[PDB]
Assembly symmetry: C3
């Protein structure tokens, strides 16, 4: 508890752009420590589709979603947040993992040219959303990309229902984002000089509750082809997914969610053998799967219109040998 | 079972406008009893926002949502429903807690000037939605405010997964309502003389499946500022939330749902350590939380556009001493 | 595992139009077998409402949803899929129950005039969605009716949380479908000659994410009146529900879901005493209920606007004697 006791081991961590996850250990290597992270909020224009649609994003570390921070239950997460003097807005941060002052948002308001340091004890294990929440403009900052997630691993690592340890070989972080880009009378998306010039039009669109794009990792096709996530037959993978503003229903086409903490909380036992899971807006979830077959797999939001029309689909390229017991073409497409 | 056996202890209860809950005991004080409630349906105009938008509501006891009725498993809930002769429509009631005749709706159709008495055994423990369901106009009455909820507490009170008793100090009831108010060619909401004059326009809006307002307790800001819910550090609070027509994803900004019966049923173990929970349209849920930090907390539907743009946000004013172990500002917003 | 070992008992099954389920046994009668099914995809015009709205459906065995296939855990499902030479499009199939090649979709692309045979081991118990998924046109084929579901029963039948066997007397399959029919400037739905002529307009509607109709069994009122599902007081019924593209929240008006596998997976314990359950788009779920009272019951998607305005409501006609202990009208609607 005491302020003198918090002078515990400190550990500076360097973050790695979504979606790889910075280095960490699944089983806590020692006792509680103060884990240090630094993030800069960047207001910048990004292209969200193959047709050149520009968006004035508000991005932690320049990415959409912001990076995944990983700590263990009972460690203290100390974050240094910086708001560049070139930015035009005040920003703060709300960790769903934190207890108090609006997720930390009440203690972190910084205008262009300032920085602040917030520390909180990660008391609850699970994956949680974090995002900017400026008074009067909460929705707008969040739907501009300003959100991400953190993982508070139990000190002894992950397990299933009856305490059986679940260790993953790889971990990926998929941040799903809903964008509301305005259009002109000609149906062509609009461009603006500064973020603020877009506020009014953007809000008229937000109110319809219908996004124009729904993307993984900031852009349509951001995680496909050359940027496809990878694994091999036999590897245990954990996929952390988050949606700060609206619902999503992840589905691994060709596979399943062997263990899924749909609510993202590790003290709540995982659902098993899932085909499609549900993550409500404002939450993060995690699914663990062991690959059985090689090939490409499509990871999508199972509202297939959002997946294939709006932009919410990613690829997994898996290597290994085919298993004919699991599945096999008895008669390939042939004339009748 | 027998009709002669139902002549058990009777208990008349007086209801208290949402969202306080009428007096009751968590642990059933004795044996089964017949609990008596009386409600009047009021057709009246209400203002749902700060810009003066009028709605012809259909409100149980004059409120939106209607009051919370609390009983214990196996008690009989006897309700006297009255439809004032000044009303213009027939109304009935459908308790999701009841078994038979369409939730009781088939046995309770009353035109202006009538009353009826329905009794049912509360066989299943949990929170359940109730609402008017007149044949041919079900959606319309429900989205006009005519819904509320009841709680069927286990005879021995609430508990967590391993039978550990969970006793709350306070209980609040948040009814979330989606309104579909029509607009004229000028984008200005429309006013009508009688509820029926609005039916046609209202339906054209309902079909878009997009509400114009989503409010807690009948109006934008109904539960903020002076009307903020209260608690103190250390108090155990139960928040019952209900949505009779559409989905919501509650989130206590700055806190969590320590135990959440997302499905609202007490025989289904609660999820623990939740950041954001999901309640499907047509259901009620409950979250139990012990306050750890003082300050204001925002209770919202985590689709932040519905929260901050459409009207779905409430406040919690908590008193007590700040805990710097949980969270602390190491460096307040300062120049860089 | 071995190819020689797969020469096990074969069993040809004849499918029965939704929603009756082909004959089967709840407890696996022997050892693993190769269960054989045959389906033909039919491109045909269907009327989805009482106002004569035509849709160019893509239907397995001529129905919307396609039939329910039932097998046991570890059996092999061998499906012969045929694409009539009169059809105009290529079609394939994606079983959420299968592991590999995109649910089998990568191994089953067939143009008009072809057939193929795919086999997969049903390793995971639960209800799963299946649907066509042609590259470049996935959403469009699915929202045209091309989806259905299968059930992989545990070898020893269904049970609740503590292994207590749950045997059903009847089983019904409700497939919920969201349709996006285009309209002309006059608000009147449009008709087309061939499916392809509709593609462009249909997509403009899909992007709004708002269906024009949401129906059970292919049409508004498809399962009402003369086509009402039936049961009697005392019968245990299992209702399998599926939604391949969007969310639904089933509710049995007048009853409950005694045991509900909302996620549709049998190794994930069921939630009990449900009023309204949630099934995410891209998944199938199942609810078990024992009827207690006679009368009509409405089975609906609890977003009452989709239920009563868009078309998502079915009937259950139950016979037996009324139980006055559960519910009783103490004072019928009378003057005040
Ligand atoms: Cu911001
Ligand atoms: Cu939040
Ligand atoms: Cu009414
Ligand atoms: Cu209802
Ligand atoms: Cu097809
Ligand atoms: Cu699928």
């Amino acid at each position: 508890t005491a302020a003198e006791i918090a002078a515990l081991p400190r550990q500076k961590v360097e973050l790695v752009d979504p979606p790889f996850v910075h280095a960490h250990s699944q089983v806590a290597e020692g006792g509680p420590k103060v884990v240090e992270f630094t993030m800069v909020i960047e207001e910048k224009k990004i292209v969200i589709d193959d047709a050149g649609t520009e968006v004035h994003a508000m991005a932690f570390n320049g990415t959409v979603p912001g990076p995944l921070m990983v700590v263990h239950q009972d460690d203290y997460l100390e974050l240094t947040l910086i708001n560049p003097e070139t930015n035009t807005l005040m920003h703060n941060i709300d960790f769903h993992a934190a207890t108090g002052a609006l997720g930390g948002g009440g203690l972190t308001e910084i205008n262009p040219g300032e920085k602040t340091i917030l520390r909180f004890k990660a008391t609850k294990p699970g994956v949680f959303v974090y995002h900017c929440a400026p008074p009067g403009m909460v929705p707008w900052h969040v739907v501009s990309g300003e959100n991400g997630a953190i993982m508070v691993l139990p000190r002894e690592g992950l397990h299933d229902g009856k305490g059986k340890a679940l260790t993953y070989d790889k971990i990926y972080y998929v941040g799903e984002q809903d964008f509301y880009v305005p259009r002109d009378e000609n149906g062509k998306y609009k461009k603006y000089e500064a973020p603020g010039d877009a506020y009014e039009d953007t809000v008229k669109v937000m109110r319809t509750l219908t996004p124009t794009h729904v993307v993984f990792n900031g852009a349509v096709g951001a995680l496909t082809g050359d940027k496809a996530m990878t694994a091999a037959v036999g590897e245990k993978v954990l996929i952390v997914h988050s949606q700060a503003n609206r619902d999503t229903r992840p589905h691994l086409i060709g596979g399943h969610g062997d263990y899924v903490w749909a609510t993202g909380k590790f003290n709540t036992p995982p659902d098993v053998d899932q085909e499609t899971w549900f993550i409500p807006g404002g939450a993060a979830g995690a699914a663990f799967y062991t690959f059985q077959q090689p090939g490409i797999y499509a990871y999508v939001n199972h509202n297939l219109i959002e997946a294939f029309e709006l932009g919410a689909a990613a690829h997994f390229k898996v290597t290994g040998e085919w298993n004919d017991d699991l599945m096999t073409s008895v008669l390939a497409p042939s004339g009748t």
